[PDB]
Nucleic acid binder design. Structure first.
Ligand SMILES: [Zn+2]
Lengths: 68, 120
RNA sequence: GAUGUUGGAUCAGGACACCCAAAUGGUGCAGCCGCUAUUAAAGGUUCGUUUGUUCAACGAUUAAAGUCCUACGUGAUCUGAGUUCAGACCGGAGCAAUCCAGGUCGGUUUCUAUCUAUUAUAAAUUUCUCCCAGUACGAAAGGACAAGAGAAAUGGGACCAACCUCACAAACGCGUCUCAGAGAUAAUUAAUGAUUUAAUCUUAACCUAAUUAACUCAUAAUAAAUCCAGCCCUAGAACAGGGCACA
RNA sequence: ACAUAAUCCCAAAAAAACAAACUCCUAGCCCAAUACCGGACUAAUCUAUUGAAACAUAGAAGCAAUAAUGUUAAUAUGAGUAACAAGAAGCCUUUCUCCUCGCACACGCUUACAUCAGUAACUAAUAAUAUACUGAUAAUUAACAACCAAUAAACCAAAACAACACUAAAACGUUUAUUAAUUACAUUGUUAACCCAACACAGGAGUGCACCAAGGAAAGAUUAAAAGAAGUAAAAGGAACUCGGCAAACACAAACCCCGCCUGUUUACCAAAAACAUCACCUCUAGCAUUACUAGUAUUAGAGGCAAUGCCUGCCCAGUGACACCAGUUUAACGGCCGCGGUAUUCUGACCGUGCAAAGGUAGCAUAAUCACUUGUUCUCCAAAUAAGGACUUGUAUGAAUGGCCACACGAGGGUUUUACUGUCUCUUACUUCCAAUCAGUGAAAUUAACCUUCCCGUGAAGAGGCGGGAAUAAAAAAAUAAGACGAGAAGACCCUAUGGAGCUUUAAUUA
RNA sequence: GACGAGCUACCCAUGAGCAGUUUAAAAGAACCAACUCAUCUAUGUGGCAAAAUAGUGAGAAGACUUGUAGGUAGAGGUGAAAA
């Protein structure tokens, strides 16, 4: 099918703004119990964990290379 | 309909699903911890517990043996599973395969990331 | 500078000049069945064979297998059987180029929905069989109204305990269960005391006895907002709904 | 007595006022308009004059734009819609898992490629990155592939792992003699990456041999709605579906016709068929030479019709054509092949009479690829048969080389009947995958006068969301259904018009 | 007045290709891969694609397929003939 007529500005605004509610803002922000950095709720920190996971990955690769 | 149904799909066929589970479990038992999507992880939990229990059954027993040979093709995983990983969980019942959530998301699909790890 | 022309499938709605079911009148209406006419559209109005039918003939039922309108409803839902144009023959017409409101075969059917509109509360509906009975009536043949009981059918709203399709604890009918008062008026038609008009008259008045569907309910489903992060669900597109013994 | 929701415009009611470009009063620029005609002026450019960053006196025009499915450019609507994108774990580089079909020689294709460096931006519909981006810098040889002796003589008996044989009468081959040539230790190219279809496009092509130790991964993620596509399974019935066993799981047993012999060929891109071709039959024209026929010679060549084969191909030369010459001949040349009346229970007419014509359908066939009436009648098939098969013959409107009647075999041709088996159907149900749905990245399209966009009853160029009167309604999305906006898409392909066009055919007329 | 047979139609010259199975001598018959075609159905319908894909089907030693080098054009050519 094809549009009968061109859309007015008002209809476009009312359609693209109100019903979609834009982006609903909740609070995901929580302070890390360890380093005190701001991170997401119900989730592990992105500071004191990713570095320890990379150090654990390097230690696992070094142990796997030393065992072989 | 989805009424009363476990055993999800995740856009993969039955063979692809089983093989995916076998691969994720391979990586899990190999590295002792892995990172994957929340759905695949949550699905992998039960099967992991099942393989662990199968390891808890017996070493000499044929049922457990051929089951372990069926799911895991790799010859490196089985002895490390039975001799090492199994005896430490001997006292535990539901105490294995812990799931945690990863803070960030992928730059492409923004897929929710989660990690599965056995108790050390 | 296009409203796509038959039929079929699908999905219906409406009209009443009613086929059937309902209420009656008359009958050359004994009775049972018919005929004719009145009131009534709530529901229902089948499955096949031949041929493109619009038809028609025929088979088996059924309470009946009604008619018409809706662009002779419905191709931005489908079908191309018919027909509206590129070929191959018969027959007719024409010296010929070719035709025929004739008959045989074949012939790609394009679109992602912008607006309007739409995405259900319910109370039912139809039949057969049995019982009184083989009595009254009638030479014989023949032969109910009412009341009661048991079965289905269509259909409304459902469910998964068995059976069935079932490779998890799900969805289904082919399986199971249920289906209800009541009040009032229809148009007929049948009356009681009774005028105008000493009689008569269902009507003029008036107290009043009784009569299909619709039209309505004594009622059954409904509504405690104002936290709901996060984890789950037989719940689910999002949302909504439910359930998890927060810091 | 007609077909969506009522009343013949609301509600009601019962049984002298209101009210128009008309008239008057008040002011003045003094008394409408379509085609067409007339008068008087304004905006803009330039020139003469004047004035100098604003104007009027005239002359001179490429002189005033809202439309032509206008032109060009910019920017919207649709729309954040359609569309594009299924392995994993790790780790600095491996492992596990999935699906196979491709490496060399070219014709070509003109640095894509290799290394390094940089990726805001463009480039590969995004990221990762990069064999297919930018910038700079590397780009292997040869005994590989291209490029070379002039002539003159000798010789018959093809190739098919071929003494041989057959037919279609045979790709490339060798020898002898004479002359002559030099640095012929050279010149180009390969090995770069792949390319034709506007695209990094499920479509395309030549040659040798592997099918794997070569190679590609459905390389964004969720949701498990409707619905669609592909696929799997099913109680009982087993074509009850339908124009048709289409489709589809299982299988292919049997029956009967039309047409065409058959193996093929034909509207590339709606027709693959009965059409054309084909062996064969017949008619008819050619006794002749060196760039067709043919380096052929009546057993050859051209032309026409028919179409294996089997049985046959009867009559008519008045007209046309053709051959001998005005007369005749010639049907496997163009074609044509009758009517009426009378005669034995009924009916029918072997027979007879008659009109007409050049001569009036012989064999065989027949409600047929033909039959109008028609669904002819009868028989078979089926519980029912406008179809089908077998007969009858008043054959509207079969007919013997545009052949007639049959015919084994053959057919992706056109029809009919039993069996077998099936989700075709009664009658649908469930599952899998790709889409649809959500989120994120990139971000269309036709369409569109502007749109605050309800319904009913009427009216209006006779089918209203914009008109009237009633009814209904706070404001905006998403997933779905296709009734309306005479929806979108093609200046109707039917009809008719224009003293339009073009193709084809002739005794249309006119003629190199 | 010219450009066009690198598409396609026919032809000339020069090359190449067409497993396997049953079989009486048989490049002989029938079936069936490549290759050459496009029967039916479905999907696709601003597409993967301005002729497609999937299943299925025909030919497949012949009137076969194909490479390269050439020839025939609009007052026409070609055409196992469909305007
Ligand atoms: Zn931290």
């Amino acid at each position: 099918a094809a549009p009968k007529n061109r859309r007015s500005i008002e209809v476009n605004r009312c359609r693209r703004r109100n019903p979609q509610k834009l982006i609903k803002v909740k609070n995901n922000i929580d302070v890390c119990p360890e380093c005190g950095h701001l991170k997401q709720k119900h989730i592990l920190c992105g500071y004191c964990x990713x570095x320890x996971x990379x150090x654990x990955x390097x230690x696992x690769x070094x142990x796997x290379x030393x065992x072989x | 309909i989805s009424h009363g149904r476990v055993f999800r799909r995740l856009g993969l066929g039955p063979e692809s699903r089983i093989h995916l589970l076998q691969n994720l479990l391979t990586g899990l038992v190999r590295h002792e911890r892995i990172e994957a999507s929340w759905a695949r992880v949550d699905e992998l939990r039960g099967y992991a517990e099942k393989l662990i229990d199968y390891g808890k059954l017996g070493d000499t027993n044929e049922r457990a043996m051929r089951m372990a040979d069926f799911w895991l093709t790799e010859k490196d995983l089985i002895p490390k599973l039975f001799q090492v990983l199994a005896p430490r969980f001997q006292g535990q019942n539901g105490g294995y395969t812990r799931m945690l959530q990863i803070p960030n998301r992928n730059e492409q699909d923004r897929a929710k990331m989660a990690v599965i790890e056995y108790k050390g």
